[PDB]
């Protein structure tokens, strides 16, 4: 019998992740931001001046050389500020954000869509639907109302 | 009539050497009339003429399983039916290699027996249904249709070497069509038949409640032939022979068979079933 | 009985040629491709050298005795020898000659790997 | 344990395939039966209801 | 809350994703994203010869595995 | 040769028919391939960081079987064929690796018939995504919910890696167990951070910071990153399915 | 129009055995599967037992009137009888004989279902 | 002519019974010349000849869509185009059941009218594409 | 040697033509897309006019010699005439004749730019 014809590669290797160095020098001026939805990215290592995230603990701000920290993202919106003073906002559905000491932010989410692609019109109808589900006493429907409200309330407040 | 093609080569030889004009495939042309003269002499004669008869089993050799040669078509035209033997099936294991899709008989029930009408009419239905499914490599091993079971066991029973006595043939086919032989596996379909016909189990294991119906006597053929199996006096005794045969088989013999793991014993059991396929 | 089963196996392999010639062995059931991998072995085993054709096959000729002809087919038919590859049956006589040839091929094939290791390390 | 291939021999599994049957028409036959049984299973329900 | 209800964090994220795909505007982006929320898959296990649906873990998110 | 000439007439016309039907497979396959090659431009970024957590040195097989009690394998197979040796090599690797303490939950119909016939009892079931809609994060989570039925120790996901249109090799994700991974996390976070295998990324600051993170959130961390791993496997195998079918179909033509 | 529509249907039916033999039934639209079933039902329905074939068929022949022969094809042509199974059309006359046969096959199916249950109850 | 395939059977009958030398399909040699004696009498005459014309629509029955037959081979070699009807389309509600690829008119446009050249020239550029698309698309 | 190189080129172009319709020209390497350009240039350069139809279609015909033709294809093969566009080789004869057409094309496009620039600048 043939001794192990196959030798499959470790699929993790094809990626090129950061090498977290404890730092023997200065900090960059701008964070290298990478943001990813399900499989495809929207931003691949783009220079960015600062970024503001929403969390369960609350809302946080990230600058160059920010402390290495990791925590859950709460389902809401996200704000990104590039070096040119402009801004770009993205609705998300949870995820994890990793900020490197070198200034390389890797964000992984299940969804990412700008605010421009959402209308308050269609958003308004789903609100009272979620409220009726929340008020309808049923463990299978109450939570659905609560969760849809969790993502809609920051949008209703952000568009306004 | 062993090969009639060889009777046509001779007529060709004669006619061509006597300077008759050839024809298709170098035959003279009136070689149809030849076999026509020969074969229309077969008949079942009127009672005015004695109620005599002569059956004819002409044989025609075939090349590469074609039915497009001249003499072959000339004879299929004449003969009532045909027993087409396919080398793909002879070579594929089964003997006699009858191909049922191409073999028919233009008389049918009127020829065969009262007791065989009701079984053959069931086998035609069963094989017509199995013909549509048997191409499928069996996937629903437990979800297999009953037709996929009965048909395959019947194909095992079709495997013979020598002739089978009428009493000894039906009782093997009745079990199939009525599903007594469904718990056994395909490969043991003939050993079953052997015991069903030559080693009466209930006579051996004491389960004798049947008054008469046993396969040892061999004189029930005439009662079966006259009364039929689907008759009040023979149906229940028949079932109360076969269900006991099945239970004794499934319990004492089948059980021991599936417990064999060695190669010596399995090769011994192997050759036994081939012998059962020949003698039965 | 053995010959009947050999002929039967090849009768099935021939029907599967019409698929293998078209789609491939990868589109056959596990049962089917086992029959394929076994019928190919039978067909390659049917081959053997003759003392007359030594000029052509470049091998000495074997004389397979009848009793030793059946046990080999029976082993090859009952799945008693499936670990052996297809090519060990080509141009031999008797399953003993196979197992010798299979040892030869295993040795040569592994030696290519140690050799390629040295050719890679020196490279 | 490798594969219990079907064969004429008893140790091998049971082969319910027939050489006379054609493989070309088998898929349509499978769809036909699987649909026909759905209609009969529903007809039982319709008669009961 | 939904935590002790028995559902997973991943079903939670997918519920949020479904809602986001609802409210967003009609266009090519929505054409892409409704695909990433629709449920069409199944599960099957092989009986002795037949196929059977392993219905112990449903695809829909409102239900709970048991 | 009347029967013979009609025989060959039938075969000839049957193959003239069969050719264009197979060509129809080809065109439909490219319609589904060009949609997915767009991923190639946008490839290899969602687990760029995730490796750093779930990656370790290449551990031998014979040792992990002794360490573990019930391993796990996830081969990702297809729903329709004419693909090639992807499904079959995926089976060959498992019989190459087969051992007592394994279990298989596959994906696709083609591991349904094959595995049960080769692996009788270890194989349990599969998952089937009719590809009318693209694959979702919730689907990979739905696969995690099946794997979580087992108290498995190491889950080797197996799939096909689209290196190019002409090469679709194998690739695996060796996922440790959560209760094993958390202990490895603490053990490695204590000592000094030295890479134990070439080509591996150092991860000491991460395994400290995750230690700062709460309990439920780290449970979600593991489940989330494993879901992304699963999803990348499914995506790579979809592209490899539609990339190997065109090859294994043009050879048929 | 009914006749030419059936001819037109069986043409497509041939074109779809040519595909189902290769791909499978799953590779066809629901609208296409529909005419597959209809042509498969018209092919079996246009069968008929004859009084002369009592020997071979084992069933009494049926005389089908022309007017009755159009309201039964045309019904099957526009999906008016798609709920009726396939084999109910096999070897019968008009449409009234069908529902008799289909009602039977429902009964003889319920028998095996409940007898399977009583087989489970006994053992 | 409805039809010439029977006319050739008649020439065969005559020639064989009068013991003329046979050939392929038992026809003589000058049975190509038989139809050339006939079809070439079709013409579009000159303005020195009244500008009259004799058109021909010879019918020839095929068998199992054979065109390798002797007479079909011959008449195709003679005729200034051809029309090819198909039973697989006649049954599928396509009547007249042409097969436009096998059907040819070497007289492409010189016959057509001013209003017809543009239209039919667009239809060629429509159907040649319709086949490349219709042939590759699925049934569904 | 020139002719055999053209046969190699156009053969490779047929293969790459089977790849472009599947993958896309961007899938091809930098070496391949160069011959994908030159093969198209060659095939367009085979297109020749005819003095026979000079009255019908209007364009002149070109009787091109043998040796001059080989130097032309050798230039297009050695890459020393690659900056010239594709359509300039369409329906011409001789490398000395296409360059007038290339200049004509450039002059025409420059006049269209000089027309558009001043027509847009005047307003």
Author numbering:
A (entry chain H): 17 to 176
B (entry chain C): 283 to 562
C (entry chain F), G (entry chain D), I (entry chain E): 379 to 501
D (entry chain N): 20 to 68
E (entry chain I): 2 to 67
F (entry chain G): 3 to 255
H (entry chain A): 283 to 422
Publication passage describing the model:
Symmetry expansion of the pseudo-C2-symmetric dimer particles was used to classify individual F1/c-ring monomers into rotational states 1, 2 and 3 and resolve structures at 3.0- to 3.9 Å resolution. The E. gracilis F1/cring maps of rotational states 1 and 2 showed strong density for IF1, but weak density in rotational state 3. Subsequent focused classification of the IF1 binding site suggested complete inhibitor binding for rotational states 1 and 2, whereas rotational state 3 displayed a mixed occupancy, with a minority (34%) of particles containing IF1 and a majority (66%) not containing the inhibitor. In all three rotational states, IF1 is bound to the βDP-αDP interface adopting a similar conformation. While E. gracilis IF1 shares the conserved C-terminal helix at the βDP-αDP interface, including an EERY consensus motif, it does not contain the N-terminal helix. Instead, a Euglenozoa-specific proline residue (P46) follows the EERY motif and produces a break in the C-terminal helix of IF1, which causes the N-terminal region to extend in the opposite direction compared to bovine IF1. This results in interactions with the C-terminal domain of the αDP-subunit via a number of residues that are conserved in Euglenozoa. As a consequence, the E. gracilis IF1, extends around the C-terminal domain of the αDP-subunit and exits the F1 through the βTP-αDP interface in close proximity of the γ-protrusion of the central stalk. Consequently, the N-terminus of the E. gracilis IF1 does not contact the central α-helical coiled coil of the central stalk, indicating a different binding mode compared to the mammalian inhibitor.
The mitochondrial ATP synthase is a membrane protein complex that generates most of the ATP in eukaryotic cells. The translocation of protons through the membrane-bound Fo part, mediated by subunit a, drives the rotation of a membrane-embedded c-ring and the attached central stalk, which together form the rotor. The torque of the rotor against the stator subunits induces conformational changes in the (αβ)3 headpiece, thereby triggering catalysis. To reveal how the mitochondrial ATP synthase is modulated by lipids and organised into a dimer shaping discoid cristae in Euglenozoan mitochondria, we determined the structure of the ATP synthase dimer from E. gracilis.
